[PDB]
Amino acid sequence: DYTLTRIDPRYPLQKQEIVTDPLNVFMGKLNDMVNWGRKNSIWPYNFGLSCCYVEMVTSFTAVHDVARFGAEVLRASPRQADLMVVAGTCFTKMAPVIQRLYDQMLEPKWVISMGACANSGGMYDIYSVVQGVDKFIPVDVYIPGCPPRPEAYMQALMLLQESIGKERRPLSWVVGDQGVYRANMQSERERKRGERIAVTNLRTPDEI
């Protein structure tokens, strides 16, 4: 239930192959503590594109306080940031800029697509809009919504957090397997279908 990805220069220039989990208990504890340190301090990239960025900075404020998860540093350079949040629409003019900003980031990096625009092009099935950000970069966590509410962005942040907590990365570049292992977790749809179906009644829309 794991996928091995390696990059070696149609985009992206990487291939995914289904590989079983190899995971020395010392190396396992080291990987767990490395993943814990990586997931408890996620440094996003300040990338202002569209509406979904405005809702992202609405998540970034005091009334929501995404700072509680250690995700508030918000570096303006792609080198200093770990996470790329594509919070907007992938226009044809802005697609190479997005690709370059993704390229200048460094391993480890993660990608969160925010909104229907970054998910699949969304409501703008138009000549100047690229239908989805996954056409040219890999995506880790998708969020639907136009815009997704801020608490949904924190929900995707926790989703990426336990995605990071169960993945295997090389500790050093001089010893070990350099390929990136990502767990094929069970999706939230059939996981939440156990209690989504049992919903019977909701509050009527004539009240506050």
């Binding site: 005091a62 998708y142 999706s187 939230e188 049992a198």
Partner: protein
Amino acid sequence: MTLKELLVGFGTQVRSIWMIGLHAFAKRETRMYPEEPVYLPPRYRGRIVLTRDPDGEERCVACNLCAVACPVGCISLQKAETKDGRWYPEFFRINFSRCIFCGLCEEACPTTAIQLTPDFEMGEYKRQDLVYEKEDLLISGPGKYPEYNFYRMAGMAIDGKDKGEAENEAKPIDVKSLLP
């Protein structure tokens, strides 16, 4: 600058520092997600579900008004008929990666089968799991409209409802009746 502007500027910096300290002696405005659940209004546009009749059947009649009223075109379904003649969707899928939660489908539904619950946690790992089939849309209850039934208003005859048994429908008068 003169000395007067310098003293005025020093006073304004001290005033700003004092007001920031006064806000520091205030109460926190943070709503602690996920420990504190988010209060959402009843008409909040969130996750799309398909509701049910009060009798226990699915309320959709596969009339395809929501699919054409959807400006993104992220609805696909096919009409099927039972032995009695009632209409249901054979399948029903929504591309949630495409849906903008604009609520036009619920507004355009003439049976109030499809509704938008106040639920926002729909994030996903892969885009293939964002296509919600009919298994992930049909819920166990009527949702926001608890007592509506289209087949009670409908003129079509179905199981348990003969001709003339709907709302404001007289009994079928035969053409062979002896009354003038």
